[PDB]
Design a protein around this ligand. Structure first.
Ligand SMILES: Cc1cc2nc3c(=O)[nH]c(=O)nc-3n(C[C@H](O)[C@H](O)[C@H](O)COP(=O)(O)OP(=O)(O)OC[C@H]3O[C@@H](n4cnc5c(N)ncnc54)[C@H](O)[C@@H]3O)c2cc1C
Ligand SMILES: Cc1cc2nc3c(=O)[nH]c(=O)nc-3n(C[C@H](O)[C@H](O)[C@H](O)COP(=O)(O)OP(=O)(O)OC[C@H]3O[C@@H](n4cnc5c(N)ncnc54)[C@H](O)[C@@H]3O)c2cc1C
Ligand SMILES: [Zn+2]
Ligand SMILES: [Zn+2]
Lengths: 488, 488
C-alpha cells in the first residue's frame, strides 16, 4: 500500500473516522494511521446529540444503526430540562454506546475507500510548506509516509499537537473522578445525576444486566482498583457495593484546554486533540465528530484545487469558536454538578430561570449543538450561518429532502419559488453545487424557513446565504464557500 | 416614663425604627430600647431598593428625604442589568447613606409618639404566655420593663434571639472582607464591581471628596488596621493607596443563617436578628425595613384585639419565606462576585441569559423586591399576594392614589366600577378598611390592573383579593386580614 496519500489522518476515533468518510465523499485519497490493532471496546459515551443525529442523517449513515431510541429529556449541570421545547432536539440518541457509533463510522469510511491502517503508530512528524512526512511504526517495523496535509485526530494526549508546535493553554486538572461498569447489584437509577452532601453520583442500566456508575467524591486529588471506587461509593451513598463485579473501571479529570490555532501550516487538528475538558454534558464525541464534518469538505476542496486556503482558514475560525463554547458549556455544567452545597443557590436560581421558554430553548440549543452559528455575512434572514433544518421537497421528478440532497457532500442551492434566473446566476458553480428546483413542504413558524424563496446550503449543512434577507449576494456566497465560477 | 408599654422593641436600627412608626400608625403604645446613645453614623449601605422606596412613599415619609437620585442601572452578582425592563424598578434610590435613612425613620417614628429610649441596653428577657419582662441597663442603672409583646430588632448578634431560644441554622463564615471610606486618592470607579485574578473590588465616590472601596481578596481567613486593607488593595489591583486617609475601616463575613421561627410565644424577631448573610446585592437593610412593614400592622391589630394570633402567624410564614429567598439571592450573588476565574463559565452563561427579557425582569424582581408574593389564596387575577402598584384615582371629591390612601396604614378597598353592592358587602369592616369609590387612571398592560373592578389592599400594600379572578370571596379576604365583621 506504501508511501503516499493526499491526506494522512492520525487516529481512528470518532473524529478520524468521520473525517475519513467526509474526505472520501470529496474524492480524496486518505490514509488513516491508528496505533490500536482493535477498537478499545470502551463506550465512555452513551448516545449522541440531536445535531450529531442530523450530521449522520445527511450522509445516509443512519440505517447502519437500525432502530435507535431517542429522547427529549435533557439537563444542564444536572438540572432537568425538557429539550422538546426546541424543534428538532427530539432527535438525540439516548443510549447508543460510543464503541457502536465508532464501529459504524469505521465501516462507513472503509466502505467509501478510506485506507485505514491499524497497528500503525505515528512516532513523529515533519512539515515543510510543500508537505508533511510522518515516521510510523507498523507490523512491518518503522517506515515513512508523506502527504499534502496531516490531520491529528489522535485524542487528548495528541502526539501531533505536541510535535507540530501547537500552543495548548487552559487549566490543569484539579480532581480525579471514577466510572465503573459493574454487574451483580441492582441500584436505583439516577440518569441525570444526584447531588450528594459530599459530591455527585450517576447510576444507569446497560444491556446484559450491566449497571453503570459515575462516582465523583469530595476531596479526591487528581488504572483504579475496583475497591477504591466501591469505597468512594460507600462514603457518598452509604451503600456497600464492594461485592459487585467490575467490568470496566476508569479514571478521568477536569483539565480544560484548547489549541490557539486549529491549523499550523499543513498540520490540522480535529477532536480531543484540539480541546480537552471535563466530560460533563455529553459534548466531547459530538463536538469531535462535528469538527470533522466542518473540516472534511473544506480540506477536500483545497486538495481538489477548487478552493484556496482562505476556505481552510474558516475551519479554524468556525471550530475554534465552537470549541471555546464547548469549554464554557462543560465547565459551567461541571461547576453545577460537582461543587458542594455551596453552589446550591445558583442551581436554584438557574432552576427558576429554566421555567422560561427562552432559557429552556437557549440551554437546549447549547447542549444539543443546534445553536451553532457561523459567520457567513450579515442579513435579516434568521437561518444565516445556522444548520439547515430538515425540509421536505417535491421536484419535477421526485420527492426528496434537504437531508437527502446532502448525502454526496456537495453544495445545495434550493430554488423554492421556481426562479429560472436564480438557476442561471449559480450555473457557473453547478460543478460543485446541486441546483434544485422544488416545492417545499409545510414549515413551522420557528424553523426560519417561512417565506424563504432560496437557500444556499454548504456541504456541512450550514446555510451560507438565503433569500430574502442576505446582505451579501448569492455569487459572493458561492465564491466564498465553493471557489471560482466556471469559465464559459 | 417607667415600666409599661403594649409592645417593646429592642434596637433602633432601620427595622426597629420602621416598626416603631408602623405600630404608632396602628395606635399602639411602643417603647424602643436602644443601647447606643448616638447613631453609629455608619452607612454601610448606600441607597435603597424600589420596593423600599414604595413602602416609604405609602406612609408619606419621602418628603423627609428631599430630592433623591434614582437609577435603573442594576446588577446581579456584578453582572449588569437594566432594571428599567421592570415597571417601577426605576424608583431605586442610588446613593442615600443608611445613616440618613435611619435618621429619617427615627424622626418619623418619634414624631408619631414612639417612646425611644437610647442608652438602654436589654441585658436579658423573660416570657410567660401572659407577657414579656426585660431587664434593662439605662442611665438610671438596672431596671425592668414589661409588655404584651417583645420584638428583637437588635441585629445580627441578637441578644433576644439567644435569650428567647430561637434556632439559628445555616453555615459558619468562611471568609473576611474589608471596606474602607478614604480620602486623598482619586480612583477609577467600579460601581457594580470588578472581577480580579485574585478576587473582586468595588470603588465609588461619596460626598466630601470621599472614595469608598470594597476589598475582597483571595485566601483571607475569617477592627482592621488601614494598612492591611491597603496591602490587600495593592495585591489585588497593583496600585499603592497606603498614603490615603482612612475615615472608616470595617470587616464583615459571609455567615448565612436564618431563624426557624420568626416568633416564639410573645417574642418576635425582625431584621438581621432573624437573618444574616453576605451583604451582596444591597438586600439586608431593605429586607429588614420590609419585615417591620409586614409585622407592624399585624401586631397592631392583635394588640388592639381586632385580630387573633392566626394573623400574627402570617408574619412568620410570609417573612420566613422572603428571608429564605434573601439567603438564596445573596449567596448566589456572592458566589458570582467572590469566586475566582473558576466561576467565569457560569457568569458567561448567566450573561447570555440576561439578554432575554423574562430573565432580566426575573432578576430585577428578585433584587428590587418587586417579586414578593404572599399566599393570600388562589385565583387567576395576576396581582394576588403581590404589592399594589401605584394607581392614580379620581373620587367624587378628590384626586388621590393607592399610595396616598395607605398613609394611615388601614386596609383599602378600591371600588373601581362604582359598585354599591361591593360597598355594602364590606361595610362591616369599614372601621378597619377604607372603602373608596374611584375612577382609576391609565394602567399598563403589565401592571396587572387592566380590567380590574375592585382590589382589597392590606395595610402593607399587598393585594389580598381582587375582582375578577379570586377563588376566595371578598368577606373571606376581609375576615382573613382584618378579623371579625362588625355586628349590626
Ligand atoms: C468518562 C467519559 C465519558 C464521556 N461521555 C461522553 C458523552 O456522553 N458524549 C460525548 O459526546 N462525549 C463523551 N466523552 C468524550 C469522548 O469520548 C471523546 O471526546 C471522543 O472520544 C474524542 O474523539 P477523538 O476522535 O477526537 O479522540 P479519541 O476517541 O481519543 O481517538 C484518538 C485515537 O487516536 C489514536 N492515537 C493516538 N496517538 C496515535 C498515534 N501516534 N498513531 C496512531 N493513532 C494514535 C488512539 O489510539 C485513538 O484511537 C466522554 C469521555 C469520557 C472520558
Ligand atoms: C458592609 C455592609 C454593607 C451593607 N450594604 C447594604 C446595602 O447596600 N443595602 C441594604 O439593604 N443593606 C446593606 N447592608 C445590611 C444592613 O446594614 C443591615 O441589614 C441592617 O442594618 C439591618 O438592620 P436591623 O435594624 O435589623 O439591625 P441593625 O441595623 O444592626 O440595628 C440593631 C440595633 O440594635 C441595637 N442593639 C443590639 N443589642 C441591643 C440591646 N441588647 N439593647 C438595646 N439595643 C440593642 C444596636 O445598637 C443596633 O442599633 C450592609 C451591611 C454591611 C455590613
Ligand atoms: Zn503499513
Ligand atoms: Zn429609662
Amino acid at each position: 500500500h506504501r508511501s503516499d496519500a493526499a491526506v494522512i489522518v492520525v487516529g481512528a476515533g470518532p473524529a478520524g473516522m468521520m473525517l475519513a468518510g467526509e474526505l472520501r465523499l470529496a474524492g480524496v485519497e486518505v490514509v488513516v494511521l491508528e496505533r490500536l490493532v482493535e477498537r478499545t471496546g470502551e463506550s465512555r459515551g452513551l448516545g449522541f446529540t440531536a445535531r450529531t443525529m442530523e450530521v449522520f442523517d445527511q450522509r445516509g449513515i443512519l440505517p447502519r444503526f437500525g432502530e435507535v431510541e431517542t429522547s427529549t429529556q435533557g439537563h444542564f449541570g444536572g438540572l432537568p430540562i425538557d429539550f422538546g421545547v426546541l424543534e428538532g432536539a427530539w432527535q438525540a440518541a439516548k443510549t447508543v454506546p460510543q464503541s457502536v457509533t465508532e464501529t459504524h463510522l469505521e465501516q462507513w469510511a472503509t466502505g467509501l475507500g478510506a485506507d485505514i491502517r491499524r497497528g500503525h503508530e505515528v512516532l513523529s512528524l515533519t512539515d515543510d510548506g510543500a508537505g508533511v512526512t510522518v515516521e510510523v511504526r507498523g507490523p512491518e517495523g518503522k517506515h515513512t509516509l508523506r502527504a499534502a496535509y496531516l490531520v491529528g485526530c489522535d485524542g487528548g494526549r495528541s502526539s501531533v499537537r505536541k510535535a507540530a508546535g501547537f500552543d495548548f493553554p487552559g487549566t490543569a486538572a484539579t480532581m480525579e473522578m471514577y466510572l465503573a461498569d459493574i454487574k451483580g447489584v441492582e441500584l436505583q437509577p439516577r440518569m441525570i445525576g444526584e447531588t450528594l452532601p459530599g459530591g455527585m453520583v450517576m447510576v444507569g442500566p446497560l444491556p446484559g444486566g450491566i449497571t453503570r456508575i459515575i462516582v465523583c467524591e469530595r476531596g479526591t486529588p487528581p488504572p483504579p482498583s475496583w475497591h477504591e471506587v466501591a469505597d468512594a461509593w460507600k462514603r457518598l451513598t452509604g451503600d456497600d457495593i464492594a461485592h459487585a463485579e467490575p467490568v470496566w473501571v476508569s479514571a478521568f479529570g477536569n483539565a480544560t484546554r484548547q489549541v490557539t490555532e486549529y491549523r499550523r501550516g499543513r498540520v490540522i487538528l480535529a477532536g480531543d486533540s484540539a480541546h480537552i475538558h471535563l466530560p460533563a454534558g455529553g459534548q466531547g464525541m459530538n463536538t469531535s465528530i462535528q469538527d470533522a464534518v466542518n473540516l472534511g469538505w473544506k480540506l477536500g476542496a483545497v486538495v481538489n484545487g477548487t478552493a484556496t486556503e482562505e476556505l481552510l482558514d474558516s475551519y479554524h475560525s468556525e471550530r475554534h469558536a465552537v470549541g471555546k463554547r464547548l469549554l464554557m458549556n462543560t465547565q459551567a455544567q461541571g461547576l453545577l454538578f460537582l461543587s458542594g452545597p455551596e453552589v446550591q443557590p445558583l442551581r436554584d436560581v438557574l432552576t427558576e430561570l429554566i421555567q422560561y421558554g427562552e432559557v429552556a430553548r437557549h440551554l437546549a440549543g447549547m447542549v444539543s449543538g443546534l445553536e451553532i452559528t457561523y459567520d457567513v455575512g450579515t442579513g435579516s434572514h434568521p437561518l444565516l450561518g445556522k444548520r439547515m433544518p430538515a425540509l421536505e421537497l417535491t421536484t419535477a421528478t421526485r420527492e426528496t429532502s434537504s437531508t437527502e440532497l446532502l448525502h454526496t457532500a456537495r453544495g445545495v442551492l434550493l430554488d423554492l419559488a421556481d426562479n429560472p434566473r436564480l438557476r442561471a446566476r449559480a450555473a457557473a458553480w453547478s460543478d460543485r453545487v446541486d441546483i434544485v428546483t422544488a416545492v417545499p413542504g409545510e414549515v413551522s413558524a420557528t424553523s426560519g424557513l417561512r417565506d424563504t424563496t432560496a437557500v444556499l446550503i454548504r456541504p456541512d449543512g450550514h446555510v451560507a446565504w438565503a433569500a430574502p434577507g442576505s446582505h451579501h449576494d448569492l455569487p459572493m456566497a458561492l465564491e466564498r464557500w465553493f471557489g471560482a465560477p466556471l469559465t464559459g
